[PDB]
Design a protein around this nucleic acid. Structure first.
Ligand SMILES: [Mg+2]
Ligand SMILES: [Mg+2]
Ligand SMILES: [Mg+2]
Ligand SMILES: [Mg+2]
Ligand SMILES: [Mg+2]
Ligand SMILES: [Mg+2]
Ligand SMILES: [Mg+2]
Ligand SMILES: [Mg+2]
Ligand SMILES: [Mg+2]
Ligand SMILES: [Mg+2]
Ligand SMILES: [Mg+2]
Ligand SMILES: [Mg+2]
Ligand SMILES: [Mg+2]
Ligand SMILES: [Mg+2]
Ligand SMILES: [Mg+2]
Ligand SMILES: [Mg+2]
Ligand SMILES: [Mg+2]
Ligand SMILES: [Mg+2]
Ligand SMILES: [Mg+2]
Ligand SMILES: [Mg+2]
Ligand SMILES: [Mg+2]
Ligand SMILES: [Mg+2]
Ligand SMILES: [Mg+2]
Ligand SMILES: [Mg+2]
Ligand SMILES: [Mg+2]
Ligand SMILES: [Mg+2]
Ligand SMILES: [Mg+2]
Ligand SMILES: [Mg+2]
Ligand SMILES: [Mg+2]
Ligand SMILES: [Mg+2]
Ligand SMILES: [Mg+2]
Ligand SMILES: [Mg+2]
Ligand SMILES: [Mg+2]
Ligand SMILES: [Mg+2]
Ligand SMILES: [Mg+2]
Ligand SMILES: [Mg+2]
Ligand SMILES: [Mg+2]
Ligand SMILES: [Mg+2]
Ligand SMILES: [Mg+2]
Ligand SMILES: [Mg+2]
Ligand SMILES: [Mg+2]
Ligand SMILES: [Mg+2]
Ligand SMILES: [Mg+2]
Ligand SMILES: [Mg+2]
Ligand SMILES: [Mg+2]
Ligand SMILES: [Mg+2]
Ligand SMILES: [Mg+2]
Ligand SMILES: [Mg+2]
Ligand SMILES: [Mg+2]
Ligand SMILES: [Mg+2]
Ligand SMILES: [Mg+2]
Ligand SMILES: [Mg+2]
Ligand SMILES: [Mg+2]
Ligand SMILES: [Mg+2]
Ligand SMILES: [Mg+2]
Ligand SMILES: [Mg+2]
Ligand SMILES: [Mg+2]
Ligand SMILES: [Mg+2]
Ligand SMILES: [Mg+2]
Ligand SMILES: [Mg+2]
Ligand SMILES: [Mg+2]
Ligand SMILES: [Mg+2]
Ligand SMILES: [Mg+2]
Ligand SMILES: [Mg+2]
Ligand SMILES: [Mg+2]
Ligand SMILES: [Mg+2]
Ligand SMILES: [Mg+2]
Ligand SMILES: [Mg+2]
Ligand SMILES: [Mg+2]
Ligand SMILES: [Mg+2]
Ligand SMILES: [Mg+2]
Ligand SMILES: [Mg+2]
Ligand SMILES: [Mg+2]
Ligand SMILES: [Mg+2]
Ligand SMILES: [Mg+2]
Ligand SMILES: [Mg+2]
Ligand SMILES: [Mg+2]
Ligand SMILES: [Mg+2]
Ligand SMILES: [Mg+2]
Ligand SMILES: [Mg+2]
Ligand SMILES: [Mg+2]
Ligand SMILES: [Mg+2]
Ligand SMILES: [Mg+2]
Ligand SMILES: [Mg+2]
Ligand SMILES: [Mg+2]
Ligand SMILES: [Mg+2]
Ligand SMILES: [Mg+2]
Ligand SMILES: [Mg+2]
Ligand SMILES: [Mg+2]
Ligand SMILES: [Mg+2]
Ligand SMILES: [Mg+2]
Ligand SMILES: [Mg+2]
Ligand SMILES: [Mg+2]
Ligand SMILES: [Mg+2]
Ligand SMILES: [Mg+2]
Ligand SMILES: [Mg+2]
Ligand SMILES: [Mg+2]
Ligand SMILES: [Mg+2]
Ligand SMILES: [Mg+2]
Ligand SMILES: [Mg+2]
Ligand SMILES: [Mg+2]
Ligand SMILES: [Mg+2]
Ligand SMILES: [Mg+2]
Ligand SMILES: [Mg+2]
Ligand SMILES: [Mg+2]
Ligand SMILES: [Mg+2]
Ligand SMILES: [Mg+2]
Ligand SMILES: [Mg+2]
Ligand SMILES: [Mg+2]
Ligand SMILES: [Mg+2]
Ligand SMILES: [Mg+2]
Ligand SMILES: [Mg+2]
Ligand SMILES: [Mg+2]
Ligand SMILES: [Mg+2]
Ligand SMILES: [Mg+2]
Ligand SMILES: [Mg+2]
Ligand SMILES: [Mg+2]
Ligand SMILES: [Mg+2]
Ligand SMILES: [Mg+2]
Ligand SMILES: [Mg+2]
Ligand SMILES: [Mg+2]
Ligand SMILES: [Mg+2]
Ligand SMILES: [Mg+2]
Ligand SMILES: [Mg+2]
Ligand SMILES: [Mg+2]
Ligand SMILES: [Mg+2]
Ligand SMILES: [Mg+2]
Ligand SMILES: [Mg+2]
Ligand SMILES: [Mg+2]
Ligand SMILES: [Mg+2]
Ligand SMILES: [Mg+2]
Ligand SMILES: [Mg+2]
Ligand SMILES: [Mg+2]
Ligand SMILES: [Mg+2]
Ligand SMILES: [Mg+2]
Ligand SMILES: [Mg+2]
Ligand SMILES: [Mg+2]
Ligand SMILES: [Mg+2]
Ligand SMILES: [Mg+2]
Ligand SMILES: [Mg+2]
Ligand SMILES: [Mg+2]
Ligand SMILES: [Mg+2]
Ligand SMILES: [Mg+2]
Ligand SMILES: [Mg+2]
Ligand SMILES: [Mg+2]
Ligand SMILES: [Mg+2]
Ligand SMILES: [Mg+2]
Ligand SMILES: [Mg+2]
Ligand SMILES: [Mg+2]
Ligand SMILES: [Mg+2]
Ligand SMILES: [Mg+2]
Ligand SMILES: [Mg+2]
Ligand SMILES: [Mg+2]
Ligand SMILES: [Mg+2]
Ligand SMILES: [Mg+2]
Ligand SMILES: [Mg+2]
Ligand SMILES: [Mg+2]
Ligand SMILES: [Mg+2]
Ligand SMILES: [Mg+2]
Ligand SMILES: [Mg+2]
Ligand SMILES: [Mg+2]
Ligand SMILES: [Mg+2]
Ligand SMILES: [Mg+2]
Ligand SMILES: [Mg+2]
Ligand SMILES: [Mg+2]
Ligand SMILES: [Mg+2]
Ligand SMILES: [Mg+2]
Ligand SMILES: [Mg+2]
Ligand SMILES: [Mg+2]
Ligand SMILES: [Mg+2]
Ligand SMILES: [Mg+2]
Ligand SMILES: [Mg+2]
Ligand SMILES: [Mg+2]
Ligand SMILES: [Mg+2]
Ligand SMILES: [Mg+2]
Ligand SMILES: [Mg+2]
Ligand SMILES: [Mg+2]
Ligand SMILES: [Mg+2]
Length: 362
RNA sequence: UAGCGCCGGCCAACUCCGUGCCAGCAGCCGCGGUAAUACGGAGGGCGCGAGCGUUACCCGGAUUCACUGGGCGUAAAGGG
RNA sequence: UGAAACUCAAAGGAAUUGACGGGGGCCCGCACAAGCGGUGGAGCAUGUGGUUUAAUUCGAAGCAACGCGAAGAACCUUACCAGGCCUUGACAUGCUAGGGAACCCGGGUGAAAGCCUGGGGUGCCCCGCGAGGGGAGCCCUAGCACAGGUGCUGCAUGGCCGUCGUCAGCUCGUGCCGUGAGGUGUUGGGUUAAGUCCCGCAACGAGCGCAACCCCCGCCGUUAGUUGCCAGCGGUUCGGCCGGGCACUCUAACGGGACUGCCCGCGAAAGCGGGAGGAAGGAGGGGACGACGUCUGGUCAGCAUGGCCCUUACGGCCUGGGCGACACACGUGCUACAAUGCCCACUACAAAGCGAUGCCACCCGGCAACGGGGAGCUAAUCGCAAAAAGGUGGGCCCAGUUCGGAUUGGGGUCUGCAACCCGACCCCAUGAAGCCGGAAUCGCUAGUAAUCGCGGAUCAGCCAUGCCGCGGUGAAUACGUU
RNA sequence: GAGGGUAGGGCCCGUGACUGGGGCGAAGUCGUAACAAGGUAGCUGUACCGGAAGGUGCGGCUGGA
RNA sequence: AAUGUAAAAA
RNA sequence: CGCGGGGUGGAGCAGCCUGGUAGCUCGUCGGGCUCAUAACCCGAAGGUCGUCGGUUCAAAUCCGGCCCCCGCAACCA
RNA sequence: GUGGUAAAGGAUGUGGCGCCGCGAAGACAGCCAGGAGGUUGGCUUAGAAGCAGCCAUCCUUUAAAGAGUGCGUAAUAGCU
C-alpha cells in the first residue's frame, strides 16, 4: 500500500505550494478595515480564507503520517513495527477523507445517475461489445453496493443490443460513473468473422442525474396580457356591438395566440389561454432539452476516430488514454474493477483538468 | 565557417531504443492496431556542399493527340 | 448535339489455376432407404452455460469443446480464496565474513507453520608432549551474484495431438506444348478398396501415398512335458491324490498353409462370374500404420522456448475454505416404468488380467459390512473367483405392484492424523417421479446391435454409472442411389 | 465631337428561401435485382406500374440452353 | 426456401 | 356548456345486449432445425378490464358520479 | 355641514359608566448619575460579541442594570 500513500501525498502536495502562496495574498488582504467596509468584497475574501481549512489539515496531518511511519516501519516481524502499523489504519480512514474531498465536488455527484450504452462503428460485432459493457457497468454497481434499475433495453439483429439505458440507484452514483462517458475501443478476433482476424469496434456511453418541472407557474396572471375587441366576419348587429375577440399575449416571451371562433368572450379567453399554455409549454420544454444539447456540448464526439480507453483482449491489456494508465486484466476490468481506476485516474484527471483550467484560464 | 536532403520499394544508404491505427508519414504502392530498416530520437551509412531541400509553372518521360509514331470483333472507339 | 465541378487508383479485355453452383455425367461411405435398439420425458450420476460467492483457479467452443487435460480434489492434490508466518529463499551454482563440527534429544509458545530456547556433543586436517589456534565438511546468521513465477502472449515458437480422412490423392526429372500464368505425364477405354492393374497415348520414367514386410484370431505339423490326462493299466482318505505316460488339451517359439493356383464361361489383357479341392478363398476376420497439405484448430497449465511483466513480493510455508455453491439451460451417462418380468433357493459353462507389510485359503464371532485367529503364495503350483445372463424348483398375478428404488430418519463398520463442509459400505425403517416420453435426434451391416457379467490402469479410501480391455448368450435388415 | 442623360435589348459573373439529382463516408434500416438455370436465363429500346431494388407487355440480342 | 459488416498474405 | 360512441395481458382487437367461465393475432420466455441469425416447428407464461360508489348471492358485463380518447353539434340576429 | 343617507379595517376626536394597578413612606412626564461583571450564554454560520436563524429560565458588586428593547458595524464599541 506504500504506493497509493505517496500518491495521495503527491495530490495533497501540489495543493500545498499553490494554495500556499494563494493564501498569503488573501490573508494580508483581510487585515485592512477598508477591505471590510466593502461588504460583498470581503465576503469572497473570507471565502478563500475559508478554503484554507481544507488546505491546512491535509498537508499537516498527512505530512506527519508519512515520516512517523517511515521510521518505525522499515524492518521487524513482531514487536514495535506491528505497533506502528495499526496507527496508520486510522490514517487509512484519513486517506478516506481525502478521497471524498476530491470526488464529492461535482454539480450532482451525490445523486443517482443514468447510464446509456449505444453501439457504433463495428457492425454486429460493435453491438456485441455494447452488451459486454452493459454487464460490465451493471456488475460494478452490484459490488459498489448499488441498485440497478434498467430503464430501457433493445437487443440487436444478431448479437443482442442496439441500445440500452440504466438507472444506478444509490449515492455518488453520478460522481462515480461521471468519468465514463465517451467512446471505448475494443480489439479482438471477431466472433463473427469467418477468418477471425483482429477487428476494432466502438461503443458509446453517457451519464446524467435527474430533475424537475415548471409548467403552470407561468400562467400566473401578472405575466400575460389579455385584450378584448370586436370579432370579425359574420355576426350581423351582434358581431358589430359585441366584442368577443380575445388575444392573450405572453409578455415574458412575446408569444401570442388570438381567438374569435365562438360568440362568447369568456369561452374564447378560455380557449386562447388553453392554447398559449401548450405553445409556451413546448418552448420551455425545448429549452430544457436545449440545455441537454449544451450537455451534448460538454462532450459529443463521433464514433471511432475518437476513444477514451482501449480494451484489447489479444495481448490482454486495457488502456485509459486520458491518463496513460494501463492494466493487463481486461477480464477483471470487464467485471467491476473500476474503483481504483475511476478513483485516481478518472477523478484526478477530470477534476484536475477542469480545476486547473478554472484557476488558470477560466 | 559546414551545412542540408535522404537511408521500406522505385532509389545509393541499416541497426538500436521509444512508440502503439495514437503520435505521426505520404510522390505513387502503402507504413503505425506492443516487439516498425516506412512515425520519432540515436549510432552508423548513402548523396551533394556555400549550399541542400520545398512549393509553383514549362518541355521530358508520354509512341498518353502517334507527321516522324497509335488505334476502333470482345479492352475506350464503325455512323442504324 | 453534349460538358464541368467534384471524386476514385483504378476501371477493364483475354486466358490460367482453384473454390463454389437451388449444372451435368460416372462413383463411393450405416449418407439416405430397409431394419434393431436408443437419447430428448422421469430419478440419479457426470461435464458445461448462467447466476451466486470471500473465493466458487485455469484451459477446451459446431462438426473436430461439453464422463474432454483429470488413469482417482476430504487435508495432499491445488494453480483460487481468508488468516498466521519466511522474505537470497523449498531446490542450483558461486564468492566472502564472523560463531559452531558433524549429529541427536527437548522444553515455553501457536491453529499449524513459524518464532523464543535448554541439553548431549566434540569426530576429520596442520603445529606442538600439552595448551592454544589454523584448515575441510556440515549448520546458524550477515552480504552479493542469483533463485522462484501454473504471471502474459499457442496470433512470436519446438514438441506432441485433433481434423478433413484410410479419402486416393499430392508431386518431381527430362522432353514437348503455350508470349505467359500454365499445360502434359496424372487425361482417355476397361479394372479394382485404391493414381489396383491392363490397354491406349507426347511423353518416358521416378518419388510421398495405396498394397505388401510387423502384431492378434481361424486349420495343421516341429521342439518343450510340474497344465491336462485312467485317453491306458494299478493302488484310491475315489480329488488326476500316488505310480505312471504326453498321446490329446493347453502353454509358447518356429514353421506349413491361399497364389484367382485348379475346373468351367466372358475378356485384347487386366479382370470378372460360377464350380472343386480346402480349416479357410477372390483383401478370410480384427489390429498397428494416417501422404502434399488444410483449419492464424489445440496446448506457453506436461515439458521446452523468443518477448514481456513481478521481485519482502505476481515468490514460499501452514491452518481453514473452495473447486462439491443452485431460481436455471444443454451435452455424455446410469437405473427404470415391470410378466420375453421381479423375488428366493439350488446347480452349471469363460476370457484376459492382476497379487508376497499385496492377493488373503479355512475357522471363529456378527443379520451384515467388518473384525479376531490363521495356512499358503515373488505366483500355468496358493490367492482375488461366486462370472453373469443361463438351467431346474418355489413364490407374486397386473397393481404404481414383491414394478421402480429416489428421498429422509435411525443405528453401525472400514481407510486415513481428520470423513461438518465432502468418502465408501451395511442393516432397519422410510418408500419419490416415473404406466415408454413434444418438436427433434444418436448408434450399428454379423459373432455386429442388443444384452450379461469379469478384469485392469489410477489409488489410503473413493464420490467409476467414467475409461481401457475380456469373455458369455446372440438378431434384424439392405428393392435401390431419386 | 469627349462625355453625360434617358429608354430598351444581348452575353457573362456573383448571390437566393427552397428544390433535383450526383460523389464520398470501417458502422444503420429495408429487402435481395445481378454474378451458378443466382433458384422466373440475362440484357436491351420502349410502355405501363410498384417503398426499393424491380416487375410485366411488345419486339430485339446472346454477351443463354 | 432470405442474409452474414468492419484489421490476415517477405 | 350539448348529444353519441369507447377505456380489456407489452401492441391492436374480441367478451358486455341476454351477469357465473377473460378469447384471437403479433410480441414475450423455454426448447429445437442452422455454421449462425431470420423464417419455420414444439411448450409455456402474461391481464387491478380508467378510478371512486352502488344493485346482486355474484359485476369486465347492470346503474350513478369523476377522469382520459374519438364522432357530431354550437344557428337568427 | 356629521345631520344631508358605503364596508372590512383603522386612530392620544369628544362625552359617559365600570374594573385593575401606582402615589404625600413623593407617583406619571421631563430631567442628572450608573445602567456592570464570568458573558464574548450554549448551538450553527465565512462571520453570528444582549442584539440573523435554532435552544433556552445562572449568580455576583448593588438601592440598581433583562442570559436582553431598538437602531447600528463585516463582526465591535457605541446611543437607548
Ligand atoms: Mg501526526
Ligand atoms: Mg521522533
Ligand atoms: Mg499479529
Ligand atoms: Mg495500533
Ligand atoms: Mg484521493
Ligand atoms: Mg422507475
Ligand atoms: Mg429490426
Ligand atoms: Mg440477441
Ligand atoms: Mg460475418
Ligand atoms: Mg469455425
Ligand atoms: Mg400571481
Ligand atoms: Mg370580414
Ligand atoms: Mg354569411
Ligand atoms: Mg347568416
Ligand atoms: Mg351585446
Ligand atoms: Mg356591449
Ligand atoms: Mg367568428
Ligand atoms: Mg364555433
Ligand atoms: Mg429563455
Ligand atoms: Mg466515423
Ligand atoms: Mg473474478
Ligand atoms: Mg535526396
Ligand atoms: Mg536518385
Ligand atoms: Mg538501397
Ligand atoms: Mg501517445
Ligand atoms: Mg508500451
Ligand atoms: Mg520496435
Ligand atoms: Mg506489428
Ligand atoms: Mg521513407
Ligand atoms: Mg527512422
Ligand atoms: Mg548520423
Ligand atoms: Mg561554388
Ligand atoms: Mg509533362
Ligand atoms: Mg504531357
Ligand atoms: Mg507527345
Ligand atoms: Mg493505342
Ligand atoms: Mg478499319
Ligand atoms: Mg471516355
Ligand atoms: Mg453509311
Ligand atoms: Mg449515312
Ligand atoms: Mg453503335
Ligand atoms: Mg442517327
Ligand atoms: Mg465524348
Ligand atoms: Mg470528360
Ligand atoms: Mg456548372
Ligand atoms: Mg471446403
Ligand atoms: Mg449414422
Ligand atoms: Mg462400416
Ligand atoms: Mg433409417
Ligand atoms: Mg428417452
Ligand atoms: Mg432426462
Ligand atoms: Mg454445453
Ligand atoms: Mg447472493
Ligand atoms: Mg491460461
Ligand atoms: Mg473456465
Ligand atoms: Mg476424473
Ligand atoms: Mg493468502
Ligand atoms: Mg542460499
Ligand atoms: Mg570476491
Ligand atoms: Mg520442540
Ligand atoms: Mg516440562
Ligand atoms: Mg580432514
Ligand atoms: Mg589430508
Ligand atoms: Mg594436508
Ligand atoms: Mg596428511
Ligand atoms: Mg598431527
Ligand atoms: Mg603433531
Ligand atoms: Mg608430535
Ligand atoms: Mg593430544
Ligand atoms: Mg581439505
Ligand atoms: Mg577442500
Ligand atoms: Mg495454434
Ligand atoms: Mg505448434
Ligand atoms: Mg482431398
Ligand atoms: Mg490432379
Ligand atoms: Mg495436373
Ligand atoms: Mg472416351
Ligand atoms: Mg501406384
Ligand atoms: Mg497340434
Ligand atoms: Mg483303468
Ligand atoms: Mg480299473
Ligand atoms: Mg478299454
Ligand atoms: Mg503327477
Ligand atoms: Mg507358397
Ligand atoms: Mg488367370
Ligand atoms: Mg465358390
Ligand atoms: Mg489379414
Ligand atoms: Mg484391416
Ligand atoms: Mg499399409
Ligand atoms: Mg496455427
Ligand atoms: Mg484458443
Ligand atoms: Mg503462458
Ligand atoms: Mg514463455
Ligand atoms: Mg521464458
Ligand atoms: Mg508486486
Ligand atoms: Mg514493489
Ligand atoms: Mg496371511
Ligand atoms: Mg477373509
Ligand atoms: Mg456367524
Ligand atoms: Mg473383512
Ligand atoms: Mg479379516
Ligand atoms: Mg497345478
Ligand atoms: Mg481390485
Ligand atoms: Mg433369471
Ligand atoms: Mg418359475
Ligand atoms: Mg406411486
Ligand atoms: Mg449398534
Ligand atoms: Mg404422468
Ligand atoms: Mg402396470
Ligand atoms: Mg468394471
Ligand atoms: Mg481403486
Ligand atoms: Mg465399468
Ligand atoms: Mg455621341
Ligand atoms: Mg453616347
Ligand atoms: Mg453612363
Ligand atoms: Mg421617358
Ligand atoms: Mg443594359
Ligand atoms: Mg442567377
Ligand atoms: Mg443542393
Ligand atoms: Mg438517377
Ligand atoms: Mg440520392
Ligand atoms: Mg441535395
Ligand atoms: Mg447511384
Ligand atoms: Mg452509409
Ligand atoms: Mg442502428
Ligand atoms: Mg445500405
Ligand atoms: Mg443490410
Ligand atoms: Mg438473387
Ligand atoms: Mg429470387
Ligand atoms: Mg444467368
Ligand atoms: Mg424490358
Ligand atoms: Mg409503401
Ligand atoms: Mg421477349
Ligand atoms: Mg434485327
Ligand atoms: Mg449472356
Ligand atoms: Mg441444357
Ligand atoms: Mg438485411
Ligand atoms: Mg449488415
Ligand atoms: Mg461480406
Ligand atoms: Mg372496443
Ligand atoms: Mg365509460
Ligand atoms: Mg378508448
Ligand atoms: Mg372491457
Ligand atoms: Mg391496450
Ligand atoms: Mg392499456
Ligand atoms: Mg399496460
Ligand atoms: Mg361497454
Ligand atoms: Mg406466439
Ligand atoms: Mg424463442
Ligand atoms: Mg428461438
Ligand atoms: Mg460463424
Ligand atoms: Mg449461438
Ligand atoms: Mg432461432
Ligand atoms: Mg426485420
Ligand atoms: Mg414440456
Ligand atoms: Mg406456440
Ligand atoms: Mg402462444
Ligand atoms: Mg396462450
Ligand atoms: Mg391464460
Ligand atoms: Mg368497467
Ligand atoms: Mg368475472
Ligand atoms: Mg361543426
Ligand atoms: Mg335573418
Ligand atoms: Mg334560418
Ligand atoms: Mg352631507
Ligand atoms: Mg366601523
Ligand atoms: Mg377601532
Ligand atoms: Mg388608549
Ligand atoms: Mg422609594
Ligand atoms: Mg452591557
Ligand atoms: Mg462569544
Ligand atoms: Mg461561537
Ligand atoms: Mg456588550
Ligand atoms: Mg448584528
Ligand atoms: Mg432551578
Ligand atoms: Mg464607526
Ligand atoms: Mg467577524
Ligand atoms: Mg453593548
Amino acid at each position: 500500500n506504500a504506493s497509493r500513500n505517496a500518491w495521495k501525498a503527491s495530490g495533497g502536495i501540489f495543493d500545498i505550494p499553490q494554495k500556499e502562496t494563494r493564501l498569503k495574498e488573501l490573508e494580508r488582504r483581510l487585515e485592512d478595515p477598508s477591505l471590510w467596509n466593502d461588504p460583498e468584497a470581503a465576503r469572497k475574501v473570507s471565502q478563500e480564507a475559508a478554503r484554507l481549512r481544507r488546505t491546512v489539515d491535509t498537508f499537516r496531518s498527512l505530512e506527519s503520517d508519512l515520516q512517523g511511519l517511515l521510521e518505525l516501519m522499515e524492518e521487524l516481524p513482531a514487536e514495535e513495527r506491528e505497533a506502528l502499523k495499526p496507527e496508520l489504519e486510522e490514517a487509512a480512514k484519513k486517506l478516506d477523507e481525502l478521497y471524498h474531498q476530491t470526488l464529492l465536488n461535482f454539480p450532482h455527484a451525490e445523486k443517482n445517475a443514468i447510464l446509456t450504452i449505444q453501439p457504433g462503428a463495428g457492425g454486429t460485432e460493435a453491438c456485441d461489445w455494447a452488451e459486454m459493457l452493459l454487464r460490465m457497468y451493471t456488475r460494478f454497481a452490484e459490488r459498489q453496493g448499488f441498485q440497478v434499475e434498467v430503464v430501457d433495453l433493445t437487443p440487436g439483429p444478431e448479437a443482442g443490443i442496439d441500445y440500452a439505458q440504466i438507472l444506478v440507484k444509490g449515492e455518488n452514483a453520478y460522481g462515480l460513473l461521471s468519468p465514463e462517458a465517451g467512446v471505448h475501443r475494443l480489439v479482438r478476433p471477431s466472433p463473427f468473422d469467418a477468418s477471425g482476424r483482429r477487428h476494432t469496434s466502438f461503443a458509446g456511453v453517457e451519464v446524467i442525474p435527474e430533475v424537475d418541472e415548471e409548467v403552470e407557474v407561468v400562467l400566473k396572471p401578472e405575466e400575460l396580457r389579455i385584450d378584448v375587441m370586436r370579432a370579425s366576419g359574420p355576426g350581423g348587429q351582434g358581431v358589430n356591438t359585441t366584442d368577443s375577440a380575445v388575444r392573450v399575449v405572453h409578455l415574458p416571451t412575446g408569444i401570442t395566440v388570438t381567438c374569435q371562433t365562438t360568440r362568447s368572450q369568456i369561452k374564447n379567453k378560455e380557449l386562447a389561454l388553453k392554447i398559449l399554455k401548450a405553445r409556451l409549454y413546448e418552448l420551455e420544454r425545448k429549452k430544457r432539452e436545449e440545455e441537454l444539447k449544451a450537455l451534448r456540448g460538454e462532450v459529443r464526439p463521433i464514433e471511432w476516430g475518437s476513444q477514451i480507453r482501449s480494451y484489447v483482449l489479444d495481448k490482454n491489456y486495457v488502456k485509459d488514454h486520458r491518463t496513460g494508465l494501463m492494466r493487463h486484466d481486461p477480464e477483471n476490468v470487464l467485471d467491476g474493477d473500476l474503483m481504483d481506476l475511476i478513483w485516481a485516474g478518472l477523478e484526478w484527471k477530470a477534476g484536475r483538468r477542469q480545476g486547473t483550467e478554472e484557476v488558470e484560464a477560466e
